Every structure is written in structure tokens, then in C-alpha cells.
Design an enzyme around this catalytic site. Structure first.
Site, short mmCIF file in Angstrom:
data_model
loop_
_atom_site.label_atom_id
_atom_site.label_comp_id
_atom_site.label_asym_id
_atom_site.label_seq_id
_atom_site.Cartn_x
_atom_site.Cartn_y
_atom_site.Cartn_z
N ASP A 23 8.33 3.38 -0.47
CA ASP A 23 6.88 3.52 -0.51
C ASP A 23 6.25 2.19 -0.91
O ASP A 23 6.26 1.83 -2.09
CB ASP A 23 6.50 4.64 -1.48
CG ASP A 23 5.00 4.86 -1.59
OD1 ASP A 23 4.25 4.25 -0.81
OD2 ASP A 23 4.58 5.64 -2.47
N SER A 64 -7.58 -6.37 8.77
CA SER A 64 -7.46 -6.34 10.22
C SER A 64 -8.71 -6.92 10.86
O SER A 64 -9.82 -6.81 10.33
CB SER A 64 -7.23 -4.91 10.71
OG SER A 64 -7.27 -4.85 12.12
#
Length: 330
Positions: free
Chosen positions: A35, A199
Site C-alpha cells: 500500500d 497530472s
């Protein structure tokens, strides 16, 4: 030194991936969920409330000659419904794919939330976010990656998650045969303790690319792709019959629809998520309504590039003193 381990989806929908980890001496092998969104290594154990264990493999510190109780240390991690997993702390030897760390904090669960009890295929989590998120008190502990950094050939690990297929986590090296083209690196902010990046935009299907900054985290521990409401609405508008359902808690679509791909930008590079990756199957057995893999982050507060996005790429987690994230097509 390096390490390499195969990671396997736990079910036919790729809801999560488990990776075998050796703990203790002699080795006890547990299947852990790697994780990058958390920073604790916690396991089901002989100390877990027996009614909260349903098929998991448990870590037994009393049978490990190298285990040491960390006197007075406790840990507590909080979850969605107010539930929490918590326990005490041991140190022990931990090995991943041939890479061995001694004196790693292994957090033994005394109680776990029901959501983990229901999931018999996951024996625990191995956190790979930054160590400032570790919940051990009063002395914060380092992650497996942080403890291994010094002996790694290169301070990197890579995630190569499969679509309905096994994949690979590598530590200490970049397998140049696992991707095509170039790796595009992008800056990481560690201010909240996540692998956080920006992004450069998105496209739906073969539509125009929309240049817009989307700040989010690379999180192998989250199944879906959570993006701002404007982006998610633009995507599902291209799926006939798709709608947001409050009873289901997200966008659903007719199972007979074909989903468009989703492209997200990394610098000037583009990662394309095939439409098949966004189909998470019927909301209930026999239903003709299917659950979507792209959902709104409005309720979450942070955008999450989960497994849906990461499994479309070869992803480099570069833990150099100035950390970066690398993306390549594969």
C-alpha cells in the site's frame, strides 16, 4: 542488493493485490497488501481477537526467535466508518523476494475492523508511503522501504500491476525489459506524506486532450480511480445510460455498454487506460447494472490514482533525496 516478488490479484475484479512476505525466524509467510498510500506494516497475529480472524494466516511472534516486543509501543490506524485496527509492536526480520531487513517494526493487530475480517485473502498491509505517516506511538517507526534504502543498489521500487493477471514489485532496480519507450519522471510533493504528484490533463476516448492540473496521489492500496467531479462527469457522459446512483454510491452503467478509454497526462507523456479496465462488474449478482472504475473524489478530499490507473503503466517510485515518480507504457 535487490528484491523481486510476484503480486497476485485477490479476485476476478482486481480489487486488491497480495504479495508473499517472509516474517521472522524461521520464516512465516504472510500475503500482504502493498500500500503506497499508508506507512504501517501490520499483520493478523496470534494476538488478534479470535472472533475477528476468519481464514487469515496469522503471525506468531512467540515462534520467531528474532522477534522482540517493542516495550510500550502501540499503533492505531483509522478508517472510514469510524472503525480502526490497532495493537502492539514487535521488531523482527522481514524479507520480500530475497531482500531482507532486520529490526523492522511489525505491528501486531489486537483488533481489526470488520472489513478486514471479511477479506480472508489479505493477511495484512505493508505501507510504502513516507515514514512520517507511521502511527506507532510514542516512537514513530520506519517503513520497510526506508529501512532497506541503504542496502538497495538504487533507492527505488517499481510497481508492475497486472490486469486480471500476476504482476511484479521490484526493489532496488529498474527492469528495462518490463516497459516500452521511455520513463517520464515527474516531481513528488511529500508534504502530506504521500507519493503526491500533478497530472497534466486528461482525454476521454479519442477526444481532445484537456490540459489541466490534477493533483493526486499514487496509491496501490486503492482499487479505483478518484478524480474531480468535472472530469468524471465528462467521462461518463460518453457512456450511454450511465448515471450517478446515490443508493449505490457512484456512477453505474449498463453492463452491455462498451467503455471508452481514459488518458491521463504525465508531463508531456500520455498513459492510456483501456476501457475494459474501468468495468468493475455487476453491482449485485445477476444485475444488469455495472459499477464504474472512475469515480468522483468530491467526498474524499484528495484525488487518488489507484490500481485502475497504475496497472496501465510501469511505475517507478524513486526514493532519492528528491523523490520522483516515473511512468512508462507497457
Amino acid at each position: 542488493s535487490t528484491g523481486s516478488a510476484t503480486t497476485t490479484p485477490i479476485d476476478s475484479l482486481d480489487d486488491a493485490y497480495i504479495t508473499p512476505v517472509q516474517i521472522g525466524t524461521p520464516a512465516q509467510t504472510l500475503n500482504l497488501d502493498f500500500d503506497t498510500g499508508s506507512s504501517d506494516l501490520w499483520v493478523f497475529s496470534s494476538e488478534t481477537t479470535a472472533s475477528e480472524v476468519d481464514g487469515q494466516t496469522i503471525y506468531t511472534p512467540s515462534k520467531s526467535t528474532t522477534a522482540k516486543l517493542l516495550s510500550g509501543a502501540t499503533w492505531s490506524i483509522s478508517y472510514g466508518d469510524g472503525s480502526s485496527s490497532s495493537g502492539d509492536v514487535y521488531t523482527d526480520t522481514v524479507s520480500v523476494g530475497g531482500l531482507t531487513v532486520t529490526g523492522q517494526a511489525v505491528e501486531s493487530a489486537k483488533k481489526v475492523s470488520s472489513s478486514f475480517t471479511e477479506d480472508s485473502t489479505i493477511d495484512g498491509l505493508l505501507g510504502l508511503a513516507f515514514s512520517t505517516l507511521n502511527t506507532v506511538s510514542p516512537t514513530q517507526q520506519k517503513t520497510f522501504f526506508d529501512n532497506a534504502k541503504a542496502s538497495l543498489d538504487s533507492p527505488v521500487f517499481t510497481a508492475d500491476l497486472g490486469y486480471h493477471a500476476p504482476g511484479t514489485y521490484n526493489f532496488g532496480f529498474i527492469d528495462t525489459t518490463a516497459y516500452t519507450g521511455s520513463i517520464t519522471y515527474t516531481a513528488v510533493s511529500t508534504k502530506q506524506g504521500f507519493w503526491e504528484w500533478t497530472s497534466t490533463g486528461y482525454a476521454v476516448g479519442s477526444g481532445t486532450f484537456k490540459s489541466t492540473s490534477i493533483d493526486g496521489i499514487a496509491d496501490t492500496g486503492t482499487t479505483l480511480l478518484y478524480l474531480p467531479a468535472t472530469v468524471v462527469s465528462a467521462y461518463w457522459a460518453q457512456v450511454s445510460g450511465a448515471k450517478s446512483s446515490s443508493s449505490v454510491g457512484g456512477y453505474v452503467f449498463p453492463c452491455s455498454a462498451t467503455l471508452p478509454s481514459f488518458t491521463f497526462g504525465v508531463g508531456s507523456a500520455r498513459i492510456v487506460i483501456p476501457g475494459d479496465y474501468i468495468d468493475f462488474g455487476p453491482i449485485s449478482t445477476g444485475s444488469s447494472s455495472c459499477f464504474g472504475g472512475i469515480q468522483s473524489s468530491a467526498g474524499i478530499g484528495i484525488n487518488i490514482f489507484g490500481d485502475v490507473a497504475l496497472k496501465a503503466a510501469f511505475v517507478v517510485f524513486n526514493g532519492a533525496t528528491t523523490p520522483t515518480l516515473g511512468f512508462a507504457s507497457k
